[PDB]
């Protein structure tokens, strides 16, 4: 009812702009290394900022750590419904996910899946995660450079996603392709996926594949296969969700949220730690001399990378924030990527400091009722990755400037060319 194009051009210095003309929805800001200066000007001089004009329509940017905490925690004032990316999904491809729901329904839906990351289950999966990590690292050449993104970050992420859903291992690349094309929709995040035809094909292949999986698993259960750790087994084991297939919106929304949830977040945290080490190489010497730093370092990698730059909200009513009046119905973008660089919260915020004692207080997982469900699984994979790196490699060299992904939402890497030096 009723009545887009992204081509990269050089982004000017933020000092050339009127404050009202600063548009941080531009999906090339991370790639061009202008994002830090743009968010700093907002934090300093317009921390609750209204952009009247953008390809996504108008929106507020909330850029200080303390103000983002308030917006994220205050779901009575700032709704996550109906979407949490800045723009809109293409027509015909809106799916309800509980990341874009408010309590109480949010809490009900999250409760139906949260067992898949139960701490007892993560512990039992440590052997498999570590095996995959070591096998992947042992397979890498040490006599020439290679692209870390496909060989390590995407490889490990795809196996993890297959495990979460007990998805056919040989088809696991499909979970990643489907997640990429959803999160990368041009109309939603300024990503490079602008062919609505391929999105319609995916959305239908995926729904057909999840239904086959559900039916295969219920047929396998009916034939006596013992239930496992995966999401489908858990849903089919609980009275509330044993019939979830008959609720197509809930069924597709829960399965897709789990796959998108861990797809480029994992991947880009795995890559981003190497980039941060490359910029701050003394931290790798510190790590080798004190390997017990790995858990805190994992938090600092996640803070410094901030794999998801924001989550969006809609004001439920007029709200005074930062000396501005956000109007009812306005979109409000919580820029975690800015909050984690806010010097009001973190001293020397742009430095990667792997023993930073407050690194765990970052906002890369958000805060409030939507605080990332997969946080401990993300931390676990990163811990095991770095433990297995330290066993094998005395040095890691980045041999070319990394290529960064076009998106205003995912902060990530498509090319990361690495040369390994094995230890003695």
Ligand X SMILES: O=C(O)CCCCCCCCCCCO
356 is in an annotated binding site: no
Q: Least distance (Å) from ligand HEM to the CB of residue 380?
A: 9
Best CA proximity match to 57, nearest among 100, 82, 25: 25
Burial string for 141-170 (b: 16+ CB within 10 Å, else e) reads eeeeebbbbebbbbbbbbbbbbbbbbbeee
Tell me: does residue 85 bind ligand X (CB under 6 A): yes
367 is in an annotated binding site: yes
Tell me: does residue 261 bind ligand X (CB under 6 A): yes
Cβ nearer to ligand HEM, comparing 185 with 420: 185
The 8 Å CB, 24+ separation contacts for 225-233 are 228/166, 229/116, 229/121, 229/124, 229/125, 229/163, 230/116, 230/163, 230/164, 230/165, 230/166, 231/113, 231/116, 231/164, 231/165, 231/166, 231/255, 231/258, 232/165, 232/166, 233/166
Q: Least distance (Å) from ligand X to the CB of residue 93?
A: 6
Among 265, 271, 299, 305, binds ligand X (CB under 6 A): 265
Per CB under 6 A, which of residues 129..188 are in contact with ligand HEM? 164
Cβ nearer to ligand X, comparing 90 with 273: 90
336 is in an annotated binding site: yes
Among 47, 90, 158, 261, binds ligand HEM (CB under 6 A): 261
Q: Is the dihedral of CA 191, 193, 195, 196 positive or negative?
A: negative
Tell me: does residue 94 bind ligand X (CB under 6 A): yes
106 is in an annotated binding site: yes
Cβ nearer to ligand X, comparing 111 with 325: 111
Beta partners for residue 274, in sequence order: none
Tell me: does residue 366 bind ligand HEM (CB under 6 A): yes
- Cα distances from 389 to residues 152, 392, 394, in angstroms, run 11, 5, 9
Per CB under 6 A, which of residues 290..309 are in contact with ligand X? 308
Best CA proximity match to 350, nearest among 33, 110, 117, 52: 33
- Interacting span for ligand HEM (CB under 6 A) from 11-19, 20-28, 347-355, 361-369: 361-369
310 is in an annotated binding site: no
377 is in the binding site of which of ligand X, ligand HEM, none (Cβ under 5 to 8 A by kind)? Answer: ligand HEM
d(CA 62, CA 74): 14
* Ordered strands of the 393-398 beta sheet: 146-147, 417-422, 393-398
Tell me: does residue 308 bind ligand HEM (CB under 6 A): yes
Interface with ligand X (CB under 6 A): 83, 85, 89, 93-95, 99, 182-183, 188, 260-261, 265, 308, 372, 374
Interface with ligand HEM (CB under 6 A): 72, 98-99, 110, 117, 164, 257-258, 261-262, 265-266, 269, 302, 307-308, 311, 364-368, 370-374, 377-378
């Amino acid at each position: 009812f009723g009545p887009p194009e992204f081509v990269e051009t050089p982004i000017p210095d933020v000092n050339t702009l009127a404050l009202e003309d600063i548009d941080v929805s531009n999906p090339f800001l991370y790639r061009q290394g202008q994002w830090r200066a743009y968010f700093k000007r907002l934090r300093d001089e317009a921390p609750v900022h209204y952009q009247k004009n953008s390809p996504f329509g108008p929106f507020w940017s909330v850029t200080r750590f303390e103000d983002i905490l308030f917006v994220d925690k205050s779901h009575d004032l700032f709704s996550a419904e109906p979407q949490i990316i800045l723009g809109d999904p293409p027509e015909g491809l809106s799916v309800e996910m509980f990341i874009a729901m408010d309590p109480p329904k949010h809490d009900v839906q999250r409760s139906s899946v949260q067992g898949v990351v139960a701490p007892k289950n993560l512990k039992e999966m440590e052997g498999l995660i570590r095996s995959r990590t070591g096998d992947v690292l042992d397979s890498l050449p040490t006599d020439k450079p290679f692209n870390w993104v496909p060989a390590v970050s995407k490889e490990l992420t795809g196996r993890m996603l297959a495990t979460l859903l007990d998805f056919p291992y040989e088809e696991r690349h499909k979970l990643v392709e489907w997640s990429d094309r959803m999160a990368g929709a041009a109309s939603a995040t300024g990503g490079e996926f602008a062919d609505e035809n391929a999105m319609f094909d995916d959305a239908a292949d995926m729904a057909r594949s999840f239904s086959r999986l559900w039916r295969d698993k219920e047929a396998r259960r009916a034939a006596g296969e013992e239930p496992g750790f995966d999401l489908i087994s858990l849903l089919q084991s609980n009275k509330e969700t044993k019939d979830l297939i008959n609720r197509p919106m809930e069924f597709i929304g829960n399965l897709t949220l789990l796959i998108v949830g861990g797809n480029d977040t994992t991947r880009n945290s795995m890559s981003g730690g190497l980039v941060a080490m490359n910029e701050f190489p003394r931290e790798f010497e510190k790590l080798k001399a004190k390997p017990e730093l790995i858990p805190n370092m994992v938090s600092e990698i996640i803070r410094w990378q901030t794999p998801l730059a924001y989550m969006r909200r809609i004001a439920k009513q007029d709200v005074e924030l930062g000396g501005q009046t956000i109007k009812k119905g306005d979109r409000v973008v919580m820029w975690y990527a800015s909050g984690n660089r806010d010097e009001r919260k973190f001293d020397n915020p742009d430095q990667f400091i792997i023993d930073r004692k407050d690194a765990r207080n970052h906002m890369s997982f958000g805060y409030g009722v939507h605080r990332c469900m997969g946080n401990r699984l993300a931390e676990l994979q990163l811990r095991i990755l770095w433990e297995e790196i330290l066993k094998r490699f005395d040095n890691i060299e980045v041999v070319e400037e990394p290529e960064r992904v076009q998106s205003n939402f995912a902060r990530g890497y498509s090319r990361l060319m690495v040369k390994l030096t094995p230890n003695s």
